[PDB]
Structure 1
């Protein structure tokens, strides 16, 4: 209550004062700037004028020439002159030419793409570890290889040897795999890239291999990084025809997935994190340990772990003395954690239909009957074979 508001007012007396001070000293207080900043801005602007025509650099020559290609088309053999550094010149880069005699007046151009938008993430999850609590020691193997060599460089120099790489998450569904990943990217606060494995198969042919070579050049740049390939099982069935899938498209994705993660390339820091529920279809050139170190195995939790799990979800709901929290856990006999989460979303859906705004012992024992009927109606064994 008060804790939050003291700090929020403290950063709105910082933001206000700094903006008034920093605006006044660019428009009135000029002494280390003044003459010397008015001469440098005047020289660079006059010398190149405007309009400036953006080009794309195909190749450099080291005697200070370049072959640039306009994007319209007409090619040009331009000169590298004045107010330019050759440290940023290189293929693919965007340069400014003077619209009459085209000389490279400088490089400052980087123009964001809608193909680098889909890959990069803006998110900051609203859950952090210990909303996953339970299966406690399964996030305490992903913290030994993702978080821990960044935080303490000391311990991995003290033992020596190369540090771990990667992890695979596989196992029973309803064991939280998707939120486990969404928690190791929020703790560290490293640049978290995120791609589903089903975008790597597209109707277009051989477009697979170009897309994931792109993903890893973006990742190497922002390094240190975490790459989520969520659902790399999906590459096993999703296909649009038999050549947009089939041996053809599945081999192209392997080959690619193999180069990015270990090749001649001599990759910088990409940690990889994969979500999956198929281990017996993966490349045998990845579950080769020594790309991917400790793999994590997940199973349905047991009755005391499911007591820690039902306590995270039931504080959300309205609380009463009537509620029998311990007896929903007991009756369930190694049932997953995705059901426990479908039962507390079902308790406030029955509660709203009544228009009674208390969640009590009656609303939870009714919501368990609806959750056990969908999975049990789909069991058409009836009289046990």
Structure 2
């Protein structure tokens, strides 16, 4: 009956996100201000009810959701459109009803629905079975507790706003475009993703990277980072020739991979090698270079045109 939804804390702060600080402000006003100063909502001043996040896949929509949850200071519900599709062919939406009941009983709460362009795909003919009933279930259940006493905020997520119907479109409120990161945002993400490795230095390299990598997502950036972090491990694996670097003041001679031609090149493998005596290769520009060679652009520009078209049409507001 219940179907358990996790409300635990994905500890991702505001500062861990880059860009669209204006949407961030809208969110601060939508949750934080209500939390902080509820008595400001007497008379005709009333909380925002629904926000859709729309844009290409891989743009930290989920990441944003995590940050929201961390920052909400209240009950947070998260669900994928995968969940609660069908059981018997007859019974689906009762679970939706019960979910909303649960949320209403926990004020303040926030519901996050991922991939709202699934359920509600939408395509005709085949909709008339259970799916139209679902579509209806959304529309009616958003009408229920909406007036007067609200402690629910609805966050949707979508890749394809243009296939989301008129009926949802001007009932469900506030829509915000989540673009791919620009040079600045990319650079900042690079700087965020470092770890303990001393790596290659300055901001010059970072800005070089964020410039050179363009049309890529946060996810893609993450991938590149992981790649580069593994590249020294890859060096360690493939070269069995190693060599001493550090002085004898340490525990012992500290060994790093080198070419077979190198002076001091001992060729035993990783297997014999003690924990202390380890010298990982530094993280160089070349790791990022090879990563870029391996990095292919994801999304066709037609999708950009459709997102841009929706934006020209509906944009930074619900409608």
The normalised TM-score by structure 1 is 0.59
Q: Which structure is higher in strand share?
A: 1
Aligned partner of 1:309 in structure 2 is 189
Contact 1:134 1:306 in 2 (8 A): no
Residue in structure 1 matched with residue 261 of structure 2 by the alignment: none
Deviations 1:149-180 (A, max 9, x none): 121225444x8432221200001223211111
Question: 1: CA distance between counterparts of 2:196 and 2:64?
Answer: 20
How do residues 326-365 of structure 1 correspond to structure 2 at under 5 angstroms?
326-355=207-236, 356-365=280-289
The one-character-per-residue Cα deviations of 1:314-372 (angstroms, maximum 9, x if unpaired) are 35654333882221111233433322121101112222222235323222222221123
Asked if structure 1 preserves the Cα contact closer than 8 Å seen for 2:121 and 2:164, the reply is no
Change (3 A) 1:167 1:132: same
CA distance in 2, matches of 1:265, 1:328: 47
- 1:146 equivalent in structure 2: 31
Task: Single out whichever of 265-274 and 192-201 deviates more from structure 2.
Answer: 265-274
Could you tell me how far apart the structure 1 residues matched to 2:168 and 2:113 are? 14
Aligned to 1:275: 157
The 3 A distance-change label for structure 1 pair 358 and 117 is farther
- SS of the aligned residue for 1:296 comes to strand
Q: 1:299 aligns to what?
A: 179
CA gap of 1:320–1:264, structure 2 versus 1, over 3 A, is: closer
Q: Contact 1:197–1:235 at 8 Å: present in 2 too?
A: yes
1:134 and 2:19 are equivalent in the alignment: yes
- Evaluate the alpha carbon distance shift between residue 182 and residue 316 of structure 1 in structure 2; reply closer, same or farther with a 3 A threshold: farther
For residues 72-111 of structure 1, the aligned pairs below 5 Å read none
Q: Is there any run of 5+ residues in structure 2 with no aligned partner, and where? A: 237-279, 302-319
Across the aligned residues of Structure 1 and Structure 2, the Cα RMSD in angstroms comes to: 3.1
TM-score, normalization: structure 2?
0.70
Structure 2 residue matching 1:199: 3-state secondary structure: coil
CA gap of 1:155–1:269, structure 2 versus 1, over 3 A, is closer
Residue 367 of structure 1, aligned match among 282, 285, 291: 291
Unaligned regions of 5+ residues in structure 1, if any? 1-114, 380-385
Matches within 5 A, 1:11-50: none
Aligned counterpart, 1:219: 103
SS at 1:300 equivalent: coil
Aligned residues: 256
Partner of 2:49: 165
Q: Distance in 2 between matches of 1:264 and 1:127?
A: 30
1-structure distance, mates of 2:20, 2:146: 37
1:287 aligns with 2:169: yes
Equivalence for 2:116: 232
